[PDB]
Point group: D2
Chain length 426, copies 4
């Protein structure tokens, strides 16, 4: 069999040399090194390839790509139904409510390292079902159900090999892009939690190199995003890297960590060091501030004019405490003009899920069915805007599985939608 035969080093090198995808991309390893790791067969990763290709085209074609954190398949389906063109998969939300330990965790890399890959696979499965249903329903209102997924690689759950395996698993699950931050994995934090410990600049370049190598061995053009936590972090594991030494105070903690001077200066320095290894760069920041965003963007683009940036529109900010309604309304449009081409609300799904169930349950506790009927009536009203989930049986594929059943046995007595209350009452 010739199925999945690897490319030659010469073919890979020719693609690196000529495909404009790789115009601004440094690889410190060789094409021969990639082939050496591929064995005799390379599995095709259709959704990872398609998603990465679509995401790269969108980042260059659209004014910007925006996304909301999704922690369930149905969440991603509604994001795409509502007109969004990308899915954001938050590690924070996976820690809080969707990880393979079954526990609720704060955002400290506590959950099992295959948790985000499993949610990537789940979101792709949910979008595939919506795509399958749309086809049998003749629904062409959504152009692309398979929206690219950008997923959270955190600090890679250890060393370069832990990074490699997480990137490989995200690709197997069908990820389009992944982000990687310059924190110590054993002390990893939410960008907006305290107690952050940076790793040396060269160690994060190793992480970004490992993430690219896993994508190259998997033969897919995954979008690699570099995140820096240097705006708030006051600790670093080591002063070994001369690029980090300007910020080192000389003081050490009892753990052996070095105190370091935080702020935009070390973020700009790290962003420039990461740029040759990053398709997008993201700096975590303490406030939603267009002027601070402009300072970062202008400083990076002075050295790397074509470097695209990413911006976390964090729910960890109290928005109307900091900004007026006019500034809130223009916020993403203004960032887009500075080169922030991927913009995302990390914890949108956590807030939508927790608030909506609190609101319904509180009403139900007081007024029982009156509270539920208020929601059902809002759902009927949303059908005008394209909402379909009021008809919950077809939404989860009852019509699709009926079509499988009648394909196998046209005369089946046990199909689902005929005689359903959905057919009768909706």
């Amino acid at each position: 069999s010739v199925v999945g035969t690897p490319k030659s080093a010469e073919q890979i090198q020719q693609e690196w040399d000529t495909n404009p995808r790789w115009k601004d991309v440094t690889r410190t390893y060789s094409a021969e090194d990639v082939v050496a790791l591929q064995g005799s067969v390379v599995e095709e990763h259709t959704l990872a390839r398609r998603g990465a290709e679509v995401l790269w085209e969108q980042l260059h074609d659209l004014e910007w790509v925006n996304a909301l954190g999704a922690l369930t398949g149905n969440m991603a389906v509604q994001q795409v139904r509502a007109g969004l063109k990308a899915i954001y998969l938050s590690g924070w939300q996976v820690a809080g409510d969707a990880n393979l330990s079954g526990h609720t965790y704060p955002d400290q890399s506590l959950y099992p390292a295959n948790s985000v890959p499993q949610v990537v696979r789940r979101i792709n499965n949910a979008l595939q079902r919506a795509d399958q249903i749309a086809k049998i329903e003749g629904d062409t209102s959504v152009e692309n159900w398979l929206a690219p997924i950008v997923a959270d690689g955190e600090a890679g759950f250890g060393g370069a090999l832990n990074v490699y395996e997480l990137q490989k698993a995200l690709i197997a699950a069908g990820v389009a892009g992944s982000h990687w931050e310059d924190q110590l994995a054993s002390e990893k934090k939410c960008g907006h939690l305290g107690g952050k410990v940076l790793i040396p600049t060269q160690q994060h370049i190793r992480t970004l190199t490992s993430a690219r190598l896993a994508a190259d061995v998997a033969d897919v053009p995954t979008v690699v995003i570099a995140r820096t936590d240097a705006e708030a972090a006051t600790l670093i594991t080591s002063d070994v890297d001369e690029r980090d030494q300007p910020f080192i105070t000389g003081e050490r903690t009892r753990e052996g960590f070095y105190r370091t001077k935080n702020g935009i200066e070390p973020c700009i320095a790290r962003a420039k060091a990461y740029a040759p290894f990053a398709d997008l760069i993201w700096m975590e920041t303490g406030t939603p501030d267009l002027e601070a965003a402009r300072q970062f963007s202008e400083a990076v683009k002075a050295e790397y004019p074509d470097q695209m940036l990413a911006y976390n529109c964090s729910p960890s900010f109290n928005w109307k405490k900091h900004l007026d309604d006019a500034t809130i309304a223009k916020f993403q449009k203004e960032l887009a003009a500075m080169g922030f081409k991927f913009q995302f609300i990390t914890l949108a799904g956590f807030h939508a899920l927790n608030y909506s169930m609190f609101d319904l349950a509180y009403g139900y506790a007081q007024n029982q069915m009156s509270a539920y009927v208020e929601l059902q009536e809002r759902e009927f009203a949303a059908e005008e805007r394209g909402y379909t989930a009021t008809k919950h049986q077809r939404e989860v594929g009852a019509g699709y599985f009926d079509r499988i059943a009648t394909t196998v046995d046209p005369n089946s007595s046990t199909t689902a939608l005929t005689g359903s209350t959905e057919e009768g009452q909706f």
Copy 2:
């Protein structure tokens, strides 16, 4: 070690004979049969025991117990924060958005049989975290974070042994109660989908016997709920049971199923047959109708006066198409007076999750951050009603893990909440 030493058959029999929990409960097997299956060690199932005890007390103490379908841990936490005293775990919602295949499924027993147990364990873990956080915060506003979970056993994913293993896994995960329906597992449907096939009355008694046996071997007083699908089902696998023969038309399908006359009559007959084996009885119905509910309740209670009933307030009903606002407002209160002591909205979580994300995403697609700020402002406003999740770091246990970190090393340089944007 004497840890987990089994009870004697004599001790089990004495408990069956004297505990009022077992007043109305038929067991066709013996205490000796239970001990024979327990090996040398019986694992304690703390959350299954506590949950089952609390649920049984609530069903007798409260006017009624009501619940909403939860498909994530955080959903269950908000249900309890909002004042609900029980969690409903829908198999439909697990099929649609929370099962171990990773696929979206319609409600036809397509997902792996350990999926509902995993969500039971997840909900218990989430309620335990809320309980842990409440303790370190000195928050006494919720009396019982460990609300009892009633979970969906569907048709047991095969035979009596598949039923046994699902009940055992639900108990291991900390379930309080489980429901079991008289459908053929291979053709299982949502109560409000078509194409339902019943199994014989005696086969469902075998299912209910197996569910009780698994609870007895696990030494926990799990609430066992019998569901009948006979109101809409027009097929049955076999005419072997004389109790089913009055409804058999004599016609068979090409699959070998028997046509049967559906409606309230076979539901009442099956409910009476199931009553000695059921802590609660549930009949699926085509419309939310207080008079039809009364007919069912009065017919069952004529033979079994103390028999408690359960009612699915289904989102599969178009509520304002059938009922006026006054009838909707009194609906659960009126059912409670008829003996429907467990009432639940099966698909509440699916609708809350899908609608809230559609609404936010649509607004965000049009107006970006303005749409998110509308939600954040609703969250701030809900703090007056007891909503806490606006402070998302403490909500998922950042303060609890900080307390572990400072217990291990009081002088740690790397705790999370100090210097957080949440604090500042």
Copy 3:
């Protein structure tokens, strides 16, 4: 937009069905248009399922026969291929007993979660991929194909036609080459050599085989579909509705409503003929390892379907030397191959190898401590003569492969694994 994973047209699918000799003897009661209607906008490529199915089909026509042993761990499959076997058998019995997603030990009654065999297919493929990766960096060309095709157990499909469909789809996603499907009631499913088996009607099993083929067609891979009949020993059937089953119905029913049926080779031959248009291979479970009974089955099926390939379970559930002499045991698989049994497998080989080897080691260790372990280590050193490599356990699980990843990322790494290892020093 991206053209990655664009589906084929119904016309292209139909042209393949009409002209590819793979489909020469294959009946599909649904249409090419029906397949495209179920594929949405994007078809995921299943590289290992495609390659495995292609290799298995070629092997079944090229080799005198394909033989396999039940594997329940990745390392088991790796050793089977290292030892020269060209296919992996994945037993549902072994998954029930020691490798299923419940974490429980079960008898073979479809008690475990339905995604358990797919997970083990993915595990075996991952293990063979690691052996393939290691062989490449070691310049080891002693094994031609590390990615041996996997034939996996679909049992009775864990419910209805839709449960069958989803199990086949998950087996394909995991990289299966072939899957087998039996005519038992899923709710009463048994090991072929346990009692209490309940058949389903002939037409219901054709529905199962149709569903298994449809899932492979929608996944766009030529999966090998194996039909198994349990009619040799089963004395119960769910229904007398199918006229093909009525000749064996006694008329008596159990209190469960099952019909008693006359078991033996006659209903197996009848069912095999009914299944043949829907089956790449046919397997009848049998009560004893008997070459003459195998010949009777083969000749009866091939009289109607001359090119129909057959499969044979060389079951550990047989007491072999109670039934056969050493000469008959030695020629057994060769003689079956000449009758058209082109896939032959020992279902529970892994269970017996694992359980016996650990009992033997643990018993010796309980008595004589390190002397018992050293006896095993010395047998491993001795087996290097036969091509065994796992004595060097660090390279066997990829320490050298991960060192190569580490030095690709950072040539100057201070923290690679094999340099300074006791394996480098002492082996």
Copy 4:
């Protein structure tokens, strides 16, 4: 409900003060700190409690406790059937053939952190099934099917909170004991691989403190084992700890070079002793004299301190030792106070060799090779082997008893009419 009501700080303190289990145990946190973390309900962990209690009793009653690495449930069942009194659960074997990624890995903490807990739960489930079957068969030949499990915590998969969560998950799964090593989690290695990086002495005390705290919050007396990798490791993350500074002698990564050998192992063992129920030093060769030097040095300061010894398959045994020394090896270690002795990778070698041997024979001679194995199994029945009868071994008789309890007249029970009933009795 009063089910799972927590103990008071006063009750916990009274147990710490008076139970001889805690005689040699330092806790740097308080009883009040433990109660503060327990919420309103404490889940009972029956198998973790029973296993830890049995293991502690065995370590004081038996000349020594020995074990083999088990990576499947059936492996553990055969170890107990054969007369072993403890199960060892190797992280190396989980990396190689039993982890939740589905991948084959070298021993570098690459697999998901809940992998060893899942195998603990699996082994307990398998031993429970063997116990259930033994009861219905009236088989009293094994006194305790629920042998204590000692499991691998590696370097805790990150920080003190990752340690805490792994210990909690091992306890939930029913572990009796867990081991924890002084390596950097991001660079973790097999004891017998190169490229090991130590963490500071105080950082490992933090790990051991976190492992004890998780057991205290879970209210079970888990056996906590401290492992040092200082015999071979030539790197350490930091020179911050004055106890480590005597061995410090930097790399491009910022690691400090350190002088390896028995001296830093003895120093670390003494520092860990107040926080460790057993202490284990990885070593380069199986050497009774080096073991004696370590044991005598630790017991000089901590006379009752029990030790653990890895009888590693990573050693080429007959290259280093004669048959006489191999025969007495565990007995001699036991006399030095090595009360837990284990062959880490026994299961990997038994599984890989047995399938290679069978598959090679089958490739050459087909059914003749399988019949050789089946005949060895029949022959082993004299020594107590039961798995030749594979249907009863995996619980066909147990599930038949469930089926007939539910419906005595069931027509679909498994063993009646089976080939096992027909051909093996």
